[PDB]
Amino acid sequence: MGKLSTHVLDTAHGTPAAAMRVELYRIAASGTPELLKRVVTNLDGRTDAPLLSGDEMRTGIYELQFHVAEYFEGRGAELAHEPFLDLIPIRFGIADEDGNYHVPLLVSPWSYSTYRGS
Amino acid sequence: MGKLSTHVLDTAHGTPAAAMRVELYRIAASGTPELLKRVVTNLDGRTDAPLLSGDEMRTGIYELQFHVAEYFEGRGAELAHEPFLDLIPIRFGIADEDGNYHVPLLVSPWSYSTYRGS
Ligand SMILES: [Cl-]
Ligand SMILES: [Cl-]
Numbered sequence: 680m681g682k683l684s685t686h687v688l689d690t691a692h693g694t695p696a697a698a699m700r701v702e703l704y705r706i707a708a709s710g711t712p713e714l715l716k717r718v719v720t721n722l723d724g725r726t727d728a729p730l731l732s733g734d735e736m737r738t739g740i741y742e743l744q745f746h747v748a749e750y751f752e753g754r755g756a757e758l759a760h761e762p763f764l765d766l767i768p769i770r771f772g773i774a775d776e777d778g779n780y781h782v783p784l785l786v787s788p789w790s791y792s793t794y795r796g797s
Numbered sequence: 798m799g800k801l802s803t804h805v806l807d808t809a810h811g812t813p814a815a816a817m818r819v820e821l822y823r824i825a826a827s828g829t830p831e832l833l834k835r836v837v838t839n840l841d842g843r844t845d846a847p848l849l850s851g852d853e854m855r856t857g858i859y860e861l862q863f864h865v866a867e868y869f870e871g872r873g874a875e876l877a878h879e880p881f882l883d884l885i886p887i888r889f890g891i892a893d894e895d896g897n898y899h900v901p902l903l904v905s906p907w908s909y910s911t912y913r914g915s
């Protein structure tokens with residue numbers, strides 16, 4: 680049934696963003712983020728398993744956190760001592776536990792974009 | 798000297814996003830957000846005073862939080878009971894307290910993008 684997935688594209692270089700660290704949180708009632716998963720993007724900028732699947736899918740507010748400065752510094756980027764982008768949180772809601780939520784991230788060290796894809 | 802500003806564009810309607818609620822946080826060393834300012838966007842989707850003025854600027858990590866579902870709901874959007882986008886956090890670093898930082902946001906209820914402006 681339901682599924683959550685992501686796909687990270689490096690727009691500075693025109694490649695998938697491989698070997699990027701990402702964490703998934705569920706934002707609790709209190710507002711406190713509960714860590715669900717730590718993952719790494721594969722060679723195609725995706726994950727080898729869905730972020731959420733089947734019974735894991737629950738309606739609510741979630742947040743993905745992407746380690747973008749780490750990725751770009753590894754790739755050779757020269758960033759400021761305090762980078763403009765370091766950790767990027769993408770906060771979003773899941774309304775349909777049976778829905779397929781695909782959330783791509785396009786990123787450079789000084790810009791990013793995201794959307795509900797398909 | 799330095800300054801922090803924002804500019805919100807509603808890409809679902811092709812207009813500046815006026816009357817959107819936004820808050821600015823400084824992220825402390827501990828990781829806990831400290832609220833610095835609450836603001837409302839003006840007719841041009843900007844703020845009537847800078848988010849941070851010269852005297853207020855400090856290097857470090859910041860986060861703007863945009864109340865996007867409230868904005869779009871008022872404009873008549875058909876959102877899910879749990880909206881795909883509700884609060885959007887934009888986390889970024891300031892490396893130079895004398896620098897001019899612009900953080901524009903482009904947003905629809907199902908997409909957004911941001912970048913370090915010039
Ligand atoms: Cl930088
Ligand atoms: Cl701006």
Ligand SMILES: [Cl-]
Nearest residue numbers: 876877880881
């Ligand atoms: Cl929605």
